[PDB]
Amino acid sequence: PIIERIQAREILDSRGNPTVQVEVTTDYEITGVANVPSGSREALELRDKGTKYEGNWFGGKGVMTAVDNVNEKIAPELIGMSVFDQRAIDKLMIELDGTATKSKLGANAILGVSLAVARAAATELGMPLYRYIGGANAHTLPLPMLNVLNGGEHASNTVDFQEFMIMPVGAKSLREALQMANKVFHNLAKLLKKAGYGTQVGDEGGFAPNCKSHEEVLDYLVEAIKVAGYTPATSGKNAIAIALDAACSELYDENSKKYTFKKLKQAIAEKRSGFEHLDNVKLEYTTDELIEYFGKLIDKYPIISIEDGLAESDWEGFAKMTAKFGSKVQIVGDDLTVTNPKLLEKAIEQKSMNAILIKLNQIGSLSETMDAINKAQKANMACVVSHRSGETEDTTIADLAVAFNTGQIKTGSMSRTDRIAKYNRLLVIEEELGEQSEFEGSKAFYNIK
Amino acid sequence: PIIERIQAREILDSRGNPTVQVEVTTDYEITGVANVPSGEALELRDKGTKYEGNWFGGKGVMTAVDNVNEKIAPELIGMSVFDQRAIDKLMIELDGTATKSKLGANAILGVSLAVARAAATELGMPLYRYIGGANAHTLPLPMLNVLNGGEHASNTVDFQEFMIMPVGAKSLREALQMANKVFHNLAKLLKKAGYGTQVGDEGGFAPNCKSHEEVLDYLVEAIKVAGYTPATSGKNAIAIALDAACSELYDENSKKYTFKKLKQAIAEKRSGFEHLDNVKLEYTTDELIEYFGKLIDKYPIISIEDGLAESDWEGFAKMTAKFGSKVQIVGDDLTVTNPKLLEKAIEQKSMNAILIKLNQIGSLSETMDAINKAQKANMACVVSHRSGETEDTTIADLAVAFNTGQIKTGSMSRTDRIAKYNRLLVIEEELGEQSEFEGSKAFYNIK
Amino acid sequence: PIIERIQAREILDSRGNPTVQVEVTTDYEITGVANVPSGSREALELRDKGTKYEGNWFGGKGVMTAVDNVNEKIAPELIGMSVFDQRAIDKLMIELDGTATKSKLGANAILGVSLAVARAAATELGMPLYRYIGGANAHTLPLPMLNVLNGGEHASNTVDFQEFMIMPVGAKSLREALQMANKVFHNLAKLLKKAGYGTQVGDEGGFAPNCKSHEEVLDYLVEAIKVAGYTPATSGKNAIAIALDAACSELYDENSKKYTFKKLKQAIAEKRSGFEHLDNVKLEYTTDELIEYFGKLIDKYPIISIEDGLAESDWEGFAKMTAKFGSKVQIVGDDLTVTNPKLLEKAIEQKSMNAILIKLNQIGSLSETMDAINKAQKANMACVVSHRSGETEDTTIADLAVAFNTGQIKTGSMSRTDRIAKYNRLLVIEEELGEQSEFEGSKAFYNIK
């Protein structure tokens, strides 16, 4: 159990940019290896711009500074500690850095060590990582929300919301959930190709076809669900629901306090070819008008969850949206809370939301992540354990979702191994648990009043 | 060392379709796990079975999974995990067909690779050392498929893969830095031109360019903007490799090769394709060879894969005779990792390199035999991914095991490709000063 | 795996002269033992002439200086290293010596350590040495070429070429190959005795009868093959072929650029008793005339391989011989290349030959030997792994030939344990592989265009 060696190295993530890998070796010659994902009160990832390492990689995105911090600063302080004292190791690193955002050592240096220690501990015990993290009753597979159609910034279409996801609520196992999602995904590809749209994929394995509006995108999701043989609905036999990430911080103007469907507005202003039947669509929204817009979408489509429906500074708007729709619809904070302990405490106090996205590398240590999950769950919030845009072959978030029986995960569309590797890990966990496992579709939403 | 348990299960590949994973457990409670890729030996899927409805298109592999658990595993329990060749022979004979069509190539390869991984782990030895011995030490020069055309792409680019090869690198780490800088500068160039930069199965871009030459011109421009020199050798050099995939363009009755997608766009008078009515679209074998000669003269092309169709043996031999002292000529569809076709290619001097795809032959022992034979014939072995990959990184250890000098495992995005590059980075670090990276000297096959 | 002790000692070789043995012991108390064989760009073996050890043994041939170099200079640098890092250990020794020919420490000091390390590593893993060196597909037994009739310098007969070998190409296993060679060897002894010739043996276990010409020697080989029940031929059922080592550096004059059959010429000049029917035989040859002489022998006899048909300085001659005969006959470099990396690169570039003899102690380390085999095989050359005149009970070259599936070995006639021990090791390897083994007779020559 005693840490004998800690070695960090620079590897690459799924977008082709550098990230940190750490290997921890114990005195029993057992090793744990972990990688750090990559995507402003959040913990600071350290890159090589402004150092002698800047030219190694495009955009100065090397992480050799963080790698050096692990090998030269963190590792000498931890050699000799028990690999099982997760909270003590994380506290030591937090205090060694000494800043609120982990800006001296780098959140990516600290998290890499934090996760590699936990993996080494679990391997030394011969215990599944989800049991090491969550204990003897870690047994519930998560309902996935899969980002199969894409808009927002980074997408050249005029779809201003960012993520349009399916959630196979009618499934009775994780394996069945993935079968349902597989059939919807490949039928969606076939519908888009037949319509003349492209079916190459974005960072998370989903499509960004040149659709003109939110409603066109949602209409494709409903049609793909039906053609696959399923029912668009938020509960029931054979049901598949829809989840959104509106990412509305990207659409908001803090001075006007208006939200704008920016790319669609620009296309209409340019009098672009196919955009005249959308000439009198509303493009600019107060907070209350946008909540009304979400209410209309909720009426029309089987929407079960909406993430970042308002901007990260619109605390009053979030609490109004949660008061109005939260007895029927999950309201998730992402940019609102950035996995930050103090913002989670405020969201609980103000009833800003009823679910939180959990991003390990936004807070920077496993212990702090466990504290956040414990606190949110006790506040009747759902914890949606999340990937980042830049992922790796590391599957820790699969074990993390089972460890705390979270009931939900957001880890990508049905393509790219940076996403699919997590689903494979969940398939293996479900097999190993056997009849000890549980899966809730509709009943996963214990947070919906 | 004694095999105690073999368990197959159904997982998913990088295209969202099912594939096989196998876990082998020894005597000593050591386990090896391996996954099977998917793109000649037959991969068995679930159409026509009780399992057909499980997944889109009937693409489940539970029939193959059952074949591992119920047919193969009882025959192997009790054998030593170190007798790789004896285990592979037993499975080959249990199936009893040339194409492994009874058990499935995906059932057999899954077990083959999981046994080898279990053996290496039980010995405490890196997989490349277990497979290739004490002198497994040479990191491969990667060819990265950053621009895409062919049958699966919506553009009019009829050839399939346009790759960069960073021949000027002095390490695998430097090779990936060079490729990273070209890839991200390429994306910037394409976006500024109004093309899209979503990616295909292998992590590369399929922009709506109008011709092979336009695609090649973007690679040269991205190489230069990234600070490197477009060249087949020398300091700071980055070269180009092609997969023409010309079986897809060939008509076996007319004996012509057609740039089909471009021909169709021009015919329907698609917008932005004016002034192309004089472009040559139809080539005999000899005309197409002269067309490759034109590209070789103009661009820093170091390798061409499947420049002719899988039936055009006479054409391959002519191409290799004409260009093979300066350009690598790779068979893919020509040989499909098949022992009798490799023998034919050696005897006829059809090519001077071969693509190595484990799941096209179906066992590790037969793949090792093929590599031994091809290297002894002065051919390069380009160890290859498939379009459907997983998080398994066996092909990285295989390329180092036989000091192959070359690998083809994807563009610079998607973890189904990047995981292999990460494994190579780890191998190079582990070897330290014992490692070698040969660069332009990797091409020992070029006369 | 950690090296804990290295001990060199002086032993004796099969000619009765000293050589080096090294024993490596790991921290698991596993030991590997290796011996160095003994036979000018080749690596330098260090002997005791000119030291206080010169009088220990005849001719100053002691190796205690090299033994001291192992125990006092090499061993302290390697204690603590992993026995599995073969390339790093060999590089350390090469750099410690610092000269191109290993002249400071001695090639025999360096190789002894190099081989003992590899044997210790393989034993610690419980792995056969051929699998440790060559990996999981090391499985092909070599076709042996056996030196059963002898001439050259060292032989008192008037046979000027050096080695006249049989190669049992029709065999389907190594065991069958040795049975074929056994029957030919003992029938040859019986033919020579019946003719009045002696049947004592030379260094490699073969006979040097008082034959008068190359043709008389070849005629005996053909007759022994026939009387044994086999067919003199380069391929086919029951075939036994002939291989030559002409050792023509010994016959060449660099100033006249002529090759001379020296001992036969001298006998004819002296008008010796039985040498008048050979009065108008040609004795002096240009390079082209000697190639013509080899062409006549190839026409008349089942010659499948010719080693050192031209002198080590006759690069143009070698490439002419390989161009003329290399699509039918193996052309082997021995003195031409002396297992030297730079001379191998030149032979590949100039197409000087299509096979190379591999002598571990001519280059001086296992890592360099593996590099040479890798490079030659990739250049479509055969690697004939070779003994030296002075051998020991060490059988490393048997495992080396299987490790790289070389297909050929040259390790002596069918007598003397310095040769037979290698054949016994090959018999044990073939038994242990079982049906996993391969043996090619004719098809071993993948290098013959």
Place this chain on the structure above:
Amino acid sequence: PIIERIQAREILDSRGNPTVQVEVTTDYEITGVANVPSGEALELRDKGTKYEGNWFGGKGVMTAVDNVNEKIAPELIGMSVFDQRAIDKLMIELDGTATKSKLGANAILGVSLAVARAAATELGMPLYRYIGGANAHTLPLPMLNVLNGGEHASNTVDFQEFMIMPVGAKSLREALQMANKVFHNLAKLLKKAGYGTQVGDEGGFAPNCKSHEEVLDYLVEAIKVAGYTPATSGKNAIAIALDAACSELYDENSKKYTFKKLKQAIAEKRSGFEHLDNVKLEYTTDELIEYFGKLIDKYPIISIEDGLAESDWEGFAKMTAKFGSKVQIVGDDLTVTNPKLLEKAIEQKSMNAILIKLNQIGSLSETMDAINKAQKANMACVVSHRSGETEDTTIADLAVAFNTGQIKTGSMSRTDRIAKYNRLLVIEEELGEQSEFEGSKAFYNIK
């Protein structure tokens, strides 16, 4: 310690003929391997069996190999590898014949020795300590057969072995240095005289000398040129030992000993044999004893083996009575390592030393009994090779195990001989200052 597996196989000896190797594996996965030499207990070969055609002359031993694997091994699995005497007794009784003619002496000895080697290795103990106990420490004085005659040699030298014995050495290492210097100087002398220096089965020379005296004169000259003194004791002394092998020269009906090869050369008036018509060629027992007396007076002869024929018991007793207080008298053919013949020789004072050949009696336990008995009778035990040897070095450990003081294992060339000297060098190094080498005091049997 429990025997788990016994495997015999067919290997080759130093003359190119088949012999037996046996591998014994214990409980603890420890293995011992032993080989059987070949030149009284019967060695079983393959004439008359299905295996006869495998090797020249029908000399295969697969019948003996099958006897180990199929008959002996099942009887021994489960016994303790340390009970050497019980294992040897079981095999002796399973065979049930005096000469081991049912299983073969080569089957039984192979197992006997492999068991002992496995036991020693499992204990971590040197083989000489396992066989002989804590006081096994004395390196033997070697007698080296550097000049050769007799039945298997083409010269006219009728006696068989002319050996040097470096009695002046103070260590085994020094003994081998002395022998090395004599051997290579002998070769130089023979070559300068126009004789050949190829070697026989035991690594020595059979030059075409004309008489025993000419051979002895070359040994004396080589000793002197090498810098040593021809003498039976003293500093820098090197002595001579003979094997006359006089059974080969004897006619049991006439009771004469004939120098047959010389007699024939002289009769056919061979060239270079003139002026020899008066040489004595035919000897009674008493005349031959007087002839040995002549040689003993002239040359530094310290030992004579088989000076009379195996049937000439009365002659041996006369020779030993006459010369035995100054010269060792060794039985070889007289006793063939046979317990009843050794008893007869002790009772009749036929000799004062015995050659010990493991495979002539057929088991390690019976050989140990014979050595115990002979040493207690004040006889030297000269542990001996056979003409057909292998890389096995058991006889080196056997000579140290019983502190025999003497070994006969070949000239100074051929690894079938030199391997034994190398093992002795290693033993002497391992013992360090605990070792002893006795030199002229090795001859505790000489009154």
